[PDB]
């Protein structure tokens with residue numbers, strides 16, 4: 104029908120021919136796989152600089168392609184533009200799937216925050232700019248939430264900085280970002296994403312501190328159970344702490360929506376001289 108036809112459209116759009124892609128050096132290589140730089144040859148002739156994320160059976164490949172087809176369809180300046188996917192096969196007969204992304208020379212936001220505290224890195228980031236990062240993330244999440252898409256892994260390390268210093272949310276799905284009900288019931292809503300956004304906001308206000316200093320990951324559920332939350336960063340506005348705090352209300356339904364948060368953030372940013 105319209106649902107199957109709509110899905111089949113998206114599947115055609117999302118796959119890239121392997122010969123239009125040249126893989127380069129490894130930029131990072133964890134347990135999940137590898138991020139590598141690459142060139143993508145475009146419709147208009149010219150090559151584009153890309154990042155290539157390499158991620159085990161035929162069932163999982165379809166699921167991957169279907170999911171990738173949904174993400175390719177996103178279109179917002181504060182949401183990373185998925186350019187397409189390639190599937191290579193290994194010699195051992197294991198299919199290696201590859202996610203093609205625009206190359207982001209300024210990297211992730213977490214590293215950028217930490218670097219800003221080092222002489223050779225980017226100049227001290229003023230609050231006006233820090234707040235603007237939060238607005239950008241809110242905007243991207245607002246978009247995603249409107250389309251009922253759940254990120255499942257919102258954190259400063261998964262927000263990327265474009266060449267114009269615009270922040271986009273990326274790396275779609277770390278105990279300290281997980282909302283209380285998701286630790287408990289293993290259930291995840293947009294209000295769970297809002298919780299993570301609160302934590303992400305706190306990362307930016309602290310210029311990259313790890314959440315909950317003094318609290319081990321295994322201590323996290325009981326810590327939150329007894330009503331403790333992230334503490335107000337020094338020299339952080341009370342109104343800004345009020346906003347981020349509202350993201351961690353015990354009852355998911357008491358937490359604001361991304362659209363409400365985004366608007367609260369913009370007003371606060373306007374008020375700054």
Ligand SMILES: Cc1cc(-c2c(C)nn(C)c2C#N)ccc1-c1nnc(N(C)Cc2ccc3nccn3c2)o1
Pocket residue numbers: 130138153154156166167168170171172174183185188202204205206207208210263273274275276
């Ligand atoms: C968006 C995205 C989607 C998927 C994914 C998943 C989990 N399931 N399906 C089906 C897909 C698809 N398609 C996987 C990874 C990403 C992603 N987003 N950001 C990145 N990075 C590796 C960060 C990055 C980006 C750009 C960049 N340039 C230099 C360095 N850089 C670093 O990875």
Ligand SMILES: [Cl-]
Pocket residue numbers: 182183184205265271
């Ligand atoms: Cl992008």
Ligand SMILES: [Cl-]
Pocket residue numbers: 205206207208264265266267
């Ligand atoms: Cl860019």
Ligand SMILES: [Cl-]
Pocket residue numbers: 310311312313
């Ligand atoms: Cl730190």
Ligand SMILES: [Cl-]
Pocket residue numbers: 314315316332333334
């Ligand atoms: Cl804390």
